């Protein structure tokens, strides 16, 4: 939420250091999100190729038809 990560957007901002521990956590979260999108892409690719990769005449839903 735009307001949730708005640490420096506030009326009564407590005096804090420059400690970016939350920033590192947010960076890790964004990296996880990107990695999740990439992993989803790779899994979808693998599934689609694997469907396309079945042996000729194998994997057909109408077995024997």
């Amino acid at each position: 939420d735009y307001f949730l990560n708005n640490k420096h957007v506030g009326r009564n901002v407590p005096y804090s250091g420059y400690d970016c521990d939350d920033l590192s956590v947010f960076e890790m979260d964004v990296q996880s999100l990107i990695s999740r999108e990439e992993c989803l892409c790779h899994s979808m690719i693998q599934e689609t190729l694997q469907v396309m990769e079945a042996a000729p005449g194998t994997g057909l839903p109408t077995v024997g038809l």
Binding site: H8, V9, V13, P14, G17, Y18, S24, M28
Partner: protein, 121 residues
């Protein structure tokens, strides 16, 4: 900033209020240097570990820029405050600090409020 701090730390004529302001500046500088040291330690860990760990500690130009974006704003605020307080002392120094307290930036506002309260105590 460091030149200013060294210039004013030696001036006994800055008086108790000036000394308190310099002390507060030194404390904030210590916090900034601690943050810089932590970031440096993370970059050094990334260099020493030899692994291209895509961790936030890996020395990217972008990772450095990201970690210093807020530090850049902080340092800009501190430098502007130092410039604005140049030549002011005593009640004039207090007035200069109060004038800088009127900033709209909540992070700058918080920092300046803490510094103002500490120096005014």
């Amino acid at each position: 900033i460091r030149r200013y701090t060294d210039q004013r730390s030696l001036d006994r004529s800055f008086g108790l209020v000036g000394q308190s302001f310099c002390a507060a500046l030194h404390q904030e500088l210590r916090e900034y240097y601690r943050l810089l040291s932590v970031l440096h330690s993370q970059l050094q860990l990334e260099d020493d570990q030899g692994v291209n760990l895509g961790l936030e500690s890996s020395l990217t130009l972008r990772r450095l820029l990201v970690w210093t974006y807020d530090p850049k704003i902080r340092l800009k605020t501190l430098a502007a405050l130092v410039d604005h307080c140049q030549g002011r002392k005593g009640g004039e120094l207090a007035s200069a600090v109060h004038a800088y307290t009127k900033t709209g930036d909540p992070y700058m506002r918080s920092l300046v409020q803490h510094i103002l309260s500490l120096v005014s105590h």
